[PDB]
Write a protein that binds this ligand. Structure first.
Ligand SMILES: CCCCCCCC/C=C\CCCCCCCC(=O)O[C@@H](COC(=O)CCCCCCCCCCCCCCC)COP(=O)([O-])OCC[N+](C)(C)C
Ligand SMILES: CCCCCCCC/C=C\CCCCCCCC(=O)O[C@@H](COC(=O)CCCCCCCCCCCCCCC)COP(=O)([O-])OCC[N+](C)(C)C
Ligand SMILES: O=c1[nH]c2cc(C(F)(F)F)c(N3CCOCC3)cc2n(CP(=O)(O)O)c1=O
Ligand SMILES: CCCCCCCC/C=C\CCCCCCCC(=O)OC[C@H](O)CO
Ligand SMILES: CCCCCCCC/C=C\CCCCCCCC(=O)OC[C@H](O)CO
Ligand SMILES: CCCCCCCCCCCCCCCC(=O)O
Ligand SMILES: CCCCCCCCCCCCCCCC(=O)O
Ligand SMILES: CCCCCCCCCCCCCCCC(=O)O
Lengths: 177, 230, 101, 99, 47, 49
């Protein structure tokens, strides 16, 4: 059907954007046995802040130091600056803008295709971000709800991109018909 | 059967599968100038079958669809080859891992029980210890049901041999080393000594034998007699 | 001690000890002997060992295939997806321009 | 006394407290532990400070040997030890991106 | 061209020997069955 | 490619590090030595094992 699809894509875009922004913001990416401030105790290693839990001084949070081959340096850079998660957030925002501007300027249907391309690119950036995150960590533990919020953002972004392209195809089908 | 690859590889395989399917669909269907049997459902099926090294039934004909297909094929080849190779490595050389390798390890986890003899220096060392790890061990053992305490070293070894890996017995190093080397060799000694103690030669409150036996023991130790005898 | 690049691997080869020396006929010998034994029983010696070897220490204390092993293939895959998307869009723009304006 | 710190410093402090007597830590001038020169039969190092009454007690990591136990009195060992192997750390190798 | 009993058997056999298909299911149910059997085959042959 | 990868992973899986002393006696890749002159040197020299 039609009419529902625009609302569903808008809702999905908002959900993906919110999830990814929260995930980049929060710090429950990794539960590891690190050190809170500078013994061992469980932590809240996020993208930026490793923070202490279930200890004498739980709730103390410190900025992660991402440094003490050229590949190692470049990976450390790319992971220190969460460029790929941030780029994911920005692309999701631009896709949201494209969907919003669809209601106006409806005549031109290449603005909704842009929305689709932005959402799919957001998904790809999210994948690269997860891969660099995990790889940098690798050079007992667990993943917290922030990581899975990032993952769910990826899934929803890819679904919303599919829907955007689907409705672009329908619009050009109507126009040619 | 998932053990050859880490959980992260499986997760990223699923992500890459969805990404590839979506990009194949987009790149094959979006252009109005094309209007490809490559809807979203057919794109997902293509990707799945490419991964499982099964047939195609359709192959992207455009440049862009072919780029997507090619990289997904390369990915699949490497990942499946790597799965098979690592499983071979697993099944060739078996590497059993000791669950605990230290005192602090026994302290931190709780899956495996452990306890000392009913009464002795082994018990007291924990009963009256101010050390973090030994304090924690005492806190656990003081209330352990069923009684983690045995009636005799023979009972202790029998109990550790009965339990698969649930129970760990704390005893003197020398007896532990003796037991380990005997049949059926069902047991091993892990980590270092928790404390230090010595065995010596006694002597009455005052005598002329003590002074020379001290020199004898040091001479034996230094010469290497005691190490060789042990 | 830093840079923490070494490791003690094998248990001790031989066995010796350190002791408190005193003159051959000094009255301090017996009391110091009893003091050492009392400390050893009380765990003070173990605590001092911990304090000076570990508390002042400048450091803390699978077989599956890891994502690090196959990371490059993921990078290549996503790079190829991006390239595919770019090529598609370039062709689409070219076709849009191609129609007789 | 307050100028120094170490395992032996704390051990000496505790020993003094148990025995109840003041003390003054003094390093060995020569810088050796103990050795009987075959010719002279001289004791250098803290063993010298013990045999020739120059000191009253040694609280250093002094091994309990036979050549040494003869001329002085050793307390029961306060720290057992031995020879051991030291090797470079494993240094787990990061796989290449394109390994 | 469609999955009768004999063609179903042939499809399954060929999927097990990794010997490609002349026909593959087109429906959601057929594709679920096919996909799961492909997974099974991949694990068992690798093993 | 698959067979050589399997060889790589199998070999890397059967690599045992050093765990004892006699393990130093058996191998020759890892050199080992003691202090120039001291108790450990003598211990080895007069060693009857
Ligand atoms: C026709 C089909 C299309 C085909 C091919 C498509 C094109 C493929 C391009 C992808 C290149 C990725 C890359 O080179 O990463 C580099 C950085 O490695 C790191 O330090 C990790 C950081 C990764 C970020 C890169 C994201 C790629 C996304 C992209 C969007 C790898 O390191 P290096 O410095 O390049 O080389 C030495 C590395 N080594 C010594 C460890 C082996
Ligand atoms: C999973 C399970 C597989 C289930 C079948 C896939 C959906 C098929 C949809 C479809 O073919 O209908 C039309 C599109 O329909 C849409 O617009 C789909 C809406 C978005 C759902 C995208 C899921 C894939 C994204 C990632 C999933 C995580 C297109 O075909 P048709 O020619 O209209 O008929
Ligand atoms: O009684 C003795 N006690 C010793 C105690 C120690 C230490 F462990 F550091 F406390 C050392 N260290 C070994 C490394 O070089 C010097 C420092 C040497 C000692 N030596 C000399 P040895 O002849 O080499 O044994 C003795 O004689
Ligand atoms: C006609 C349709 C065309 C389809 C086209 C898609 C097929 C792509 C396939 C494989 C790409 C593999 C890329 C290999 C990149 C490896 C480069 C590399 O890393 O080499 C340097 C090395 O790291 C130094 O140590
Ligand atoms: C387009 C329609 C295609 C239809 C779909 C075809 C089926 C896909 C193939 C395989 C499924 C494999 C399922 C894997 C199940 C994993 C179970 C698991 O992970 O449990 C282990 C546990 O996590 C450890 O503690
Ligand atoms: C196409 C198939 C989809 C895959 C289905 C996956 C079902 C199992 C998922 C298990 C997740 C376990 C969570 C791990 C916990 C952690 O260490 O973070
Ligand atoms: C073509 C893409 C699908 C391929 C099939 C992949 C399904 C496996 C996913 C399982 C999730 C990971 C859980 C297992 C790891 C673990 O818990 O040890
Ligand atoms: C065991 C598996 C089942 C074997 C086949 C059972 C026989 C059923 C009668 C089918 C007759 C042939 C029809 C056809 O060609 O589709």
């Amino acid at each position: 059907d039609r009419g529902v699809q625009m609302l569903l894509t808008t809702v999905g875009a908002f959900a993906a954007f919110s999830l990814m922004t929260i995930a980049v913001g929060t710090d429950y990416w990794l539960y590891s046995r690190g050190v809170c401030k500078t013994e061992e105790v469980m932590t809240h290693s996020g993208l930026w802040r490793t923070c202490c839990l279930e200890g004498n001084f739980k709730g103390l949070c410190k900025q992660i130091d991402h440094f003490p081959d050229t590949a190692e340096y470049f990976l450390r850079a790319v992971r220190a600056s969460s460029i790929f998660p941030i780029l994911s957030v920005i692309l999701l925002f631009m896709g949201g803008l494209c969907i919003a501007a669809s209601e106006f300027y409806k005549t031109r249907h290449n603005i909704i295709l842009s929305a689709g391309i932005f959402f799919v690119s957001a998904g790809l950036s999210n994948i690269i971000g997860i891969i660099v995150y995990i790889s940098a960590n690798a050079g007992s533990y667990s993943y917290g709800w922030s990581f899975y919020f990032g993952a769910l953002s990826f899934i929803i972004a890819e679904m919303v991109g599919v829907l955007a392209v689907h409705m672009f195809i329908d619009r050009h089908k109507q126009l040619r018909a | 059967f998932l053990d050859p690859l880490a959980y992260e590889i499986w997760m990223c395989i699923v992500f890459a599968y969805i990404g590839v399917s979506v990009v194949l669909f987009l790149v094959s269907r979006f252009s109005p100038y094309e209007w490809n049997e490559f809807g979203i459902f057919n794109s997902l099926w293509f990707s799945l079958g490419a991964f499982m090294r099964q047939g195609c039934d359709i192959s992207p004909r455009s440049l862009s669809g072919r780029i997507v297909g090619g990289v997904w094929w390369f990915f699949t080849l490497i990942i499946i080859s790597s799965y098979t190779a690592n499983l071979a490595a697993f099944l060739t050389v078996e590497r059993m891992v000791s669950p605990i390798e230290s005192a602090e390890d026994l302290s931190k986890q709780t899956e495996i029980a452990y306890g000392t003899l009913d009464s002795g220096s082994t018990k007291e060392f924990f009963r009256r210890s101010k050390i973090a790890v030994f304090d924690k061990m005492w806190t656990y053992m003081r209330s352990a049901e069923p009684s983690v305490f045995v009636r005799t070293t023979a009972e202790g070894v029998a109990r550790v041999r009965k339990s698969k890996g649930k129970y760990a017995y704390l005893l003197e190093s020398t007896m532990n080393e003796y037991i380990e080397q005997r049949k059926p060799c069902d047991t091993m000694k892990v980590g270092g000594n928790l404390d230090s103690k010595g065995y010596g030669i006694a002597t009455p409150k005052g005598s002329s034998l003590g002074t020379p036996v001290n020199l004898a023991v040091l001479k034996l130790s230094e010469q290497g007699v005691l190490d060789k005898l042990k | 001690r830093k840079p923490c690049d070494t490791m003690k691997v094998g248990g001790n080869l031989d066995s010796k000890g350190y002791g408190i020396a005193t003159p051959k006929g000094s009255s301090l010998g017996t009391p110091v002997n009893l003091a050492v034994l009392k400390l050893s029983e009380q765990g003070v010696l173990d605590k001092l060992k911990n304090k000076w070897w570990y508390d002042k220490g400048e450091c803390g204390a699978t077989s599956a295939l890891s994502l690090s092993n196959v990371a490059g293939v993921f990078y290549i895959l996503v790079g190829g997806l991006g390239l595919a998307m770019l090529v598609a869009l370039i062709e689409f723009c070219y076709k849009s321009r191609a129609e007789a304006k | 006394n307050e100028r120094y710190e170490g395992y032996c410093v704390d051990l000496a402090a505790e020993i003094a407290k148990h025995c109840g007597f003041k003390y003054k830590l003094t390093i060995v001038g020569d810088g050796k532990y103990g050795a009987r020169d075959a010719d002279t039969k001289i004791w250098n190092g803290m063993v010298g400070e013990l045999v020739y009454g120059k000191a009253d007690i040694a609280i250093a990591p002094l091994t309990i040997t036979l050549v040494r136990e003869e001329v002085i009195d050793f307390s029961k060992p306060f720290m057992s030890l031995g020879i051991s192997i030291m090797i470079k750390k494993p240094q787990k190798s990061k796989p290449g991106v394109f390994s």
